[PDB]
Write a protein that binds this ligand. Structure first.
Ligand SMILES: COc1ccc(C2(NCc3c[nH]nc3-c3cccs3)CC2)cc1
Lengths: 131, 130, 808
């Protein structure tokens, strides 16, 4: 709870914090905001939160329901033979096409940092990023 | 302008299960979902191991931007079929469509309960749902 | 875990039937044409995979195909296969869109395997092959047998828009029972670990669910309580099954049309008594022993003087604990279930006194003195007999004192240590088995209808055909049972088809029937059979396993069905069972067949002052050796009664498949699964359903399906629907042998139906382009929809990726 406050003060202009820095603060804090959270907090307070509203946002970004079973849903969908593996190109195409799509270098960099071989255990990939 | 590459790309990986290569049978479905029809001889001249880039180039050349579903109904000519007849033809030609998919089609293209389906309306609805 | 024997036998089941049509009129390979083949380095390297998917390459010749493997992913390398190693492929077909294997265009072996695999992998484990239902163990809770799912399968208006399920079988059986006043039997079979116990239990729970109440709840509770009790006393942990049923189970039930069990009956046969005395390593005895020693409270321990699970001669000390089994919690449940079977507190104490006495008797050591009890165990022997309410002096006399008849005079002698140990063991096995049968007999007196069953739901739960390399008497009895049930299966298929033909005026001359009566005779016939010569050798004063084999070999030379063995022809023989030749080893056949307590020890037990122990062998005859003392003689009597009952019912068959020997979800072992498809007659059921005039639709359905064969003929107001179909078939090109017109239905051979489909598609050539584009466009939309479901999950992966990027 202390780190929350220092991170806020690094990025706060005029006592308010922008949503982009509040999302950077939240990742620095080990949380995983998505554009869904960022849209919910825009509807309420706009693009600049007070420390009180910034706290509410960090609260929204908790996502307790986050586990391997949940994250693998899109990868398993394309694993037709249930091998538990997908290629790097398969996962790059998934990550850069739908949702809060990553860029192509972002997806590549994330798969290369997990393994050096082409076929990825997507259950272990999702576990590894969950920390 | 009307660039189609992002849609061509997403459709490829939809039929290929996100692999950069697509099997020939899956490639025929992919191209058909954009109204593209090849003859038997054109089919023979295709590469055996079709990858994303080949499709992106083939789609640009073969897709009809003015009349995407010209092979359902051609505006440049001077059309209606009874529902149970239309369903019969789908089943005769051995369609992959389940009973539910057929129902979404029928209420999409025909909102009313008319005893009879406008093929021009089908090409209209499907151009919108690209 | 795939042995070479399995690869060998699996490869013999594989047959090439239909031929591949990979080339067009011009002689060119259809672009992208896919086949299944059993030739692939993937198969050489992974014994789990029997077939792979390839595409035939442009340039292939007819005598020799050039293919490239596409699934599982390969190298892209072209290679050559002989056409007899190519099978047709059901490309572009959703396996989840219908439930019978027979609706596939190609039903060859690799197609069948793949259809079940992709259903299995999407957690649809039930598939029909009319009349058989196929159930593949998922080895996990799928969650589709809850009370909510029972209510859904029972209360849905039209039975046919739900996927196949065991509940579908229960619902149909009960609907026919109440619809036409006809008894039904549900036969669950398959090998250890295939899920038979769960199927049986799920169907009972369906039957016990009532729309609104069961006033006979007292009796249904006793019946549902039989499951924990029957498992404790009759189930054991083997190497391949933590809960293997070691007896055959038959139940008769009376069930209200809206659910609810009103009456019942339970029958248990061929209990594996030998398991009471010894168990292999990493195997246990019956659960009740461990449940009792681990679960009994201190007062119960004091009472019966119980020691630890590791402290008993009859229980394997190295295997007393099973992963994932709480024997103590199971004892609490068994005690409650015994109370729910309306056994008193003192009935239950007697039951466990006897179990304690069996265990204690196993600890008594004998010595060579002639035989004697060790003096250190004179108290242990005495306590064991008190625990079983037997006369310890008289039990002693029958175990150590021998009475032979020499000439015609009785002579008192002594059993030696080995023979006296066989007597002590026999007493332990016999008391255990009769105690198990007494519990069932008692339960039946609470749940059976006084006048017997007028109309009932039968339920059989058994091993299917069992084939090891060394097969003993236990496998013979199992395999005789499954020959009788095979006759039941082909009888019902033929009777139903013959009735359909006769009801529509079709000729029944071309119906096919593969009778297995000749192998049933060679196994069971009263004069000239294996079971006859087994009985004879058992009654013979000097009978031997080898003599038994010899009498068979010289008296059964009159049918293929008996084949004298090649290597070690004595003590070995082969039977031409319906599923193939099975080799049996006659060692201990006589020993095993005579493993029944007889003689004076039985009369001592009947003179127990305790009324339960009096009833254990009540009515049993005193014993020379009689055929009432032989397991095989008594079993064929049981089995014939059982089959006469079942034969008078409408049968339902659930064939249970074990997909791998590792107890692992989503693991598919093609050779093992193919061997079970063959053994459970599933492949036979597909063949049987395609023979003769297999297509049958009514005039109005035939006209709706084949309208465009001859659209003018079918859209004619002048001619009736019977004549319209005649005009279609007469003008279509079909030969007269490919169709017949019934009273109300068009009858097509399978070949004729596929030609008629291809003729109609040629008439609709000008819709090909239009229907392809409509289909594909909707396919794209359904694929995006399937992706849209999962985007919330993907947003979490992307969120955690961007988090990890910040941490760097
Ligand atoms: C000496 O004779 C035997 C034969 C078998 C057994 C055991 N099988 C009983 C059984 C368990 N499930 N299904 C069955 C049967 C199905 C058809 C007939 S028995 C445990 C092996 C014991 C003694």
């Amino acid at each position: 709870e202390s780190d929350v406050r220092i991170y806020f003060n690094e990025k706060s202009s005029g006592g308010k914090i922008s949503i982009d820095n509040a999302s950077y603060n939240a990742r620095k804090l080990g949380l995983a905001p998505s554009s869904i959270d960022e849209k919910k907090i825009k509807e309420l307070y706009g693009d600049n939160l007070t420390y009180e509203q910034y706290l509410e946002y960090l609260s929204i970004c908790v996502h307790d329901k986050d586990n391997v079973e949940e994250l693998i849903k899109m990868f398993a969908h394309f694993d037709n033979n249930c091998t538990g593996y997908l290629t790097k190109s398969q996962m790059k195409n998934i990550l850069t096409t739908w949702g809060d799509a990553l860029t192509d270098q972002e997806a590549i960099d994330a798969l290369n940092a997990f393994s050096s071989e082409d076929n990825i255990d997507y259950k272990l990939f999702c576990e590894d990023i969950l920390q | 302008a009307s660039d189609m590459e992002e849609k061509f790309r997403e459709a490829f990986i939809l039929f290929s299960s996100c692999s950069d290569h697509i099997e020939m049978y899956k490639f025929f479905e992919l191209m058909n979902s954009f109204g593209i029809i090849l003859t038997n001889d054109e089919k023979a001249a295709l590469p055996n191991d079709i990858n994303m880039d080949y499709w992106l180039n083939f789609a640009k050349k073969h897709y009809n931007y003015e009349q995407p579903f010209k092979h359902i109904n051609n505006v440049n000519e001077q059309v209606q079929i009874k529902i149970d007849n239309f369903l019969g033809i789908m089943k005769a030609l051995d369609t992959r469509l389940t009973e539910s998919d057929l129902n979404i089609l029928l209420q999409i293209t025909n909102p009313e309960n008319k005893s009879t389906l406008n093929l021009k309306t089908v090409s209209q609805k499907l151009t919108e749902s690209i | 875990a795939v042995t070479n024997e399995e690869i060998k036998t699996a490869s013999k089941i594989v047959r090439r039937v239909s031929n591949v049509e990979a080339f067009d009129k011009s002689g060119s390979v259809f672009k992208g044409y896919q086949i299944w083949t059993d030739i692939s380095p993937t198969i050489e390297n992974d014994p789990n995979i029997m077939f792979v998917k390839c595409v035939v390459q442009q340039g292939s010749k007819k005598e020799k195909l050039t293919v490239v493997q596409i699934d599982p992913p390969g190298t892209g390398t072209p290679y050559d296969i002989d056409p007899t190693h190519a099978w047709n492929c059901n490309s572009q077909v959703d396996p989840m869109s219908f439930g019978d294997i027979g609706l596939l265009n190609h039903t060859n072996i690799p197609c069948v395997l793949d259809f079940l695999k992709h259903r299995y992998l999407k957690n649809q484990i039930y598939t029909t092959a009319v009349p058989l239902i196929v159930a593949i163990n998922p080895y996990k809770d799928l969650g589709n047998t809850t009370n909510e799912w029972i209510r859904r399968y029972r209360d849905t208006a039209d039975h046919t828009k739900l996927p196949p399920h065991v509940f579908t079988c229960a619902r149909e059986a009960l609907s026919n029972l109440h619809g036409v006043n006809k008894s039904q039997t549900i036969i669950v079979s398959g090998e250890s670990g295939a899920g038979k116990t769960e199927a049986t239990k799920q169907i009972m729970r369906y039957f016990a669910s009532s729309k609104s109440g069961n006033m006979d709840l007292r009796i249904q509770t006793a019946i549902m309580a039989a499951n924990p009790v029957l498992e404790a006393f009759g189930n054991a942990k083997t190497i391949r099954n933590n809960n293997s049923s070691r007896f055959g189970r038959f139940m008769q039930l009376v069930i209200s049309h809206e659910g609810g069990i009103r009456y019942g009956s339970v029958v248990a046969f061929l209990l594996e008594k030998s398991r009471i005395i010894t168990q292999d390593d990493n195997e246990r005895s019956y659960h009740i022993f461990y449940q009792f020693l681990k679960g009994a409270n201190s007062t119960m321990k004091s009472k019966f003087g119980l020691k630890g699970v590791t402290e008993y001669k009859l229980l394997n000390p190295n295997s007393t604990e099973v992963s994932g089994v709480d024997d103590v919690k199971d004892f609490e449940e068994v005690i409650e279930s015994l109370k729910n079977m309306e056994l008193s507190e003192s009935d239950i104490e007697v039951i466990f006194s006897i179990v304690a006495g069996i265990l204690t008797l196993g600890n008594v050591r004998l010595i060579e003195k002639a035989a004697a009890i060790m003096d250190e165990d004179m108290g242990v022997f005495n306590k064991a007999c008190e625990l079983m309410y037997l006369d310890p002096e008289l039990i002693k006399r029958e175990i150590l004192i021998k009475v032979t008849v020499a000439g015609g005079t009785k002579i008192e002698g002594r059993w030696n240590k080995n023979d006296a140990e066989v007597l002590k063991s026999s007493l332990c096995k016999a008391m255990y088995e009769k105690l198990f049968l007494w519990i069932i007999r008692h339960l039946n007196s609470r749940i059976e209808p006084e006048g017997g069953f007028k109309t009932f739901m039968g339920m059989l739960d058994i091993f299917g055909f069992e084939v090891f390399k060394n097969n003993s008497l236990e496998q013979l009895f199992i395999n005789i049972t499954n020959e009788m049930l095979q006759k039941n299966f082909v009888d019902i298929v033929f009777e139903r088809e013959s009735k359909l033909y006769k009801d529509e005026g079709i000729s029944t001359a071309e119906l096919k029937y593969t009778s297995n009566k000749e192998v049933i005779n060679v196994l069971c016939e009263k004069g000239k059979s294996v079971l006859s010569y087994l009985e004879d050798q058992c009654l013979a004063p000097g009978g031997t396993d080898e003599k038994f084999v010899s009498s068979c070999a010289t008296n059964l030379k009159e049918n293929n069905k008996f084949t004298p063995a090649k290597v070690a022809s004595n003590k070995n023989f082969i039977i031409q069972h319906t599923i193939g030749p099975i080799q049996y080893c006659a060692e201990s056949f006589l020993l095993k067949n005579k493993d029944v307590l007889r003689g004076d020890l039985v009369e001592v037990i009947k003179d127990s002052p305790n009324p339960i122990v009096q009833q254990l062998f009540e009515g049993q005859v005193i014993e020379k050796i009689a055929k009432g003392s032989l397991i095989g003689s008594q079993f064929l009597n049981q089995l014939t009664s059982l089959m006469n009952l079942i034969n008078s019912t409408e049968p339902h068959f659930i064939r249970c498949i074990k997909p791998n020997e590792n107890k692992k979800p989503l693991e598919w072992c093609e050779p093992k699964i193919l061997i079970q498809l063959h053994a459970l007659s599933i492949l036979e059921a597909l063949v049987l359903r395609q023979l003769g005039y297999s297509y049958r639709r009514t005039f109005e359905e035939f006209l709706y399906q084949y309208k465009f064969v001859d659209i003018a003929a079918a859209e004619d107001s002048s001619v009736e629907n019977q004549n319209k179909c005649v005009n279609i078939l007469k003008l279509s090109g079909l030969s007269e042998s490919m169709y017949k017109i019934g009273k109300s239905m068009v009858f097509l051979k399978q070949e004729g139906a596929k030609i008629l489909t291809k003729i109609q598609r040629e008439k609709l050539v000008e819709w090909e382009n239009c229907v392809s584009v409509i289909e594909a466009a909707i396919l794209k939309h359904k694929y995006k929809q399937k992706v849209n479901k999962n985007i919330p999950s993907l947003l979490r992966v992307q969120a955690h990726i961007r988090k990890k990027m910040v941490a760097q």
